[PDB]
Design a protein around this ligand. Structure first.
Ligand code: HEM
Length: 82
């Protein structure tokens, strides 16, 4: 199962209270990951509300990181937005 969230909504979740972004048309809550993320908070938060696939892939991110991302998958991008 998965919950679908609208890009509208995701754009509201783009700051300290909620840092969510699209990667590969899925919604990753990194809100409680800001401090943890070795790349720093601002790098995600800058793209948050938007898609960051290109950045995520440009950075490579280890298999383990990709796997860890699943732990933050809170939903998919709504098909209306896809
Ligand atoms: C999907 C959620 C993400 C997870 C779980 C995650 C996890 C990690 C981890 C564990 C590292 C260490 C690199 C490694 O060992 O593979 C890292 C580095 C990094 N991440 Fe992420 N990341 C995520 C999303 C993003 C996003 C959206 C961006 C910002 C556009 C980003 C930018 C970076 C940068 C700049 C580094 C540092 C690379 C360096 O050391 O030069 N990450 N991330």
């Amino acid at each position: 199962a998965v919950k679908y969230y609208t890009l509208e909504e995701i754009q509201k979740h783009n700051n300290s209270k909620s840092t969510w972004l699209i990667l590969h048309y899925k919604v990753y809550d990194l809100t409680k990951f800001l401090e943890e993320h070795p790349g720093g908070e601002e790098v995600l938060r800058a793209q948050a509300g938007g898609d960051a696939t290109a950045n995520f892939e440009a950075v490579g991110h280890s298999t383990d990181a990709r796997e860890l991302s699943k732990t933050f998958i809170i939903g998919e991008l709504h098909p209306d937005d896809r």
